[PDB]
Ligand binder design. Structure first.
Ligand SMILES: [Zn+2]
Lengths: 49, 277
């Protein structure tokens, strides 16, 4: 039922990026692994939702 | 300079908090007025090198969960400019001077002078600890070294001192232009245990009193003034409430810039010219 009704999506999993400032606790705005969001993402996974 | 009271407070509070918490008799003195069981429970939980719990410090609005058992939240507040100088001239200098520093050093003999070596070029020497030199002592400063005549002072050939001084950036003239600001920062000790909130309040007040003597807020951030809020639930709809008592720390400080002057005049010259009308 879900495979019939859902649309194909790419799912990628959140984790906090280890670029957070050890004092201020905020992301580095230049971080390449996360583009200023505090959250980095694992490689994408194909799923239907 | 431009200044950031919040980052100053974070940098200053964290080491002081650690050094009090690793030292049991300090807490035993700070909490002498509390109920015996409150005191002993706090000292058992958070205090000493074996302490299994820990306190934490950081700015507000993190994206992660904090140690809500005991956490000092630092929260930058309001401010306003209060006093201005004529022409906005806060000061003037003949030699661009950096931050004030205090460093330990030892004398050494060199070529029948005593010298103290300092890690950075001395822009100005404020004090050599526990020494007042006479003119006979031929006190001189050069680069990053202080130098001091050996002849009468041989007993002090390894004397240990603290040097209070300030860096130099460069040899240039200018005007320090700026104004004074009065600025507030809030700090709150969050805990889901009310007795922990009350103890964190006491510890923070002790830390701020101790901070008043530091060079940082003797030279800048002057006139520390404290206000205290009610104890209240900060968050009320978890499986438990989180409590805290705010304190507001207010500081008076200078915001200013080094406006360097390139113009220099090194000779007047005179001429007479004749008017035949
Ligand atoms: Zn990052």
């Amino acid at each position: 039922f879900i495979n019939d009704r859902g649309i194909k999506v790419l799912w990628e999993e959140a984790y906090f990026c280890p670029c957070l400032n050890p004092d201020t606790g905020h992301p580095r705005v230049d971080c390449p692994r996360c583009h200023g969001k505090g959250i980095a993402y694992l490689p994408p996974k194909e799923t239907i939702m | 300079a431009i200044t950031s009271v919040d980052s100053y407070l974070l940098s200053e509070i964290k080491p002081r908090l650690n050094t009090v918490l690793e030292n049991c008799y300090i807490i035993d003195e700070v909490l002498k007025d509390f109920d015996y069981q409150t005191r002993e429970s706090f000292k058992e939980a958070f205090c000493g090198k074996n302490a299994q719990h820990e306190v934490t410090v950081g700015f507000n609005f993190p994206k992660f969960k904090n140690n809500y058992e005991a956490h000092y939240l630092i929260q930058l507040g309001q401010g306003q400019e209060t006093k201005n100088s004529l022409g906005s001239i806060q000061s003037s200098y003949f030699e661009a001077t950096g931050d004030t520093l205090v460093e330990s050093s030892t004398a050494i003999r060199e070529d029948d002078k005593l010298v103290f070596t300092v890690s950075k070029p001395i822009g100005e020497l404020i004090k050599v600890e526990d020494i007042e030199f006479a003119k006979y002592d031929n006190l001189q400063v050069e680069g990053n070294k202080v130098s001091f005549k050996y002849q009468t002072n041989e007993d002090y050939e390894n004397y240990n001192a603290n040097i209070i001084f300030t860096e130099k950036k460069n040899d240039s003239k200018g005007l320090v232009k700026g104004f004074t600001v009065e600025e507030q920062v809030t700090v709150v000790g969050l805990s889901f245990n009310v007795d922990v909130a009350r103890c964190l309040d006491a510890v923070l007040k002790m830390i701020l009193i101790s901070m008043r003597d530091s060079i940082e807020e003797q030279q800048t951030f002057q006139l520390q003034n404290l206000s205290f809020g009610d104890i209240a639930p900060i968050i009320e709809d978890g499986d438990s409430m989180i409590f805290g008592r705010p304190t507001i720390i207010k500081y008076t400080s200078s915001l200013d810039l080094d406006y360097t002057i390139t113009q220099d005049i090194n000779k007047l010259t005179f001429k007479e010219r004749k008017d035949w009308k």
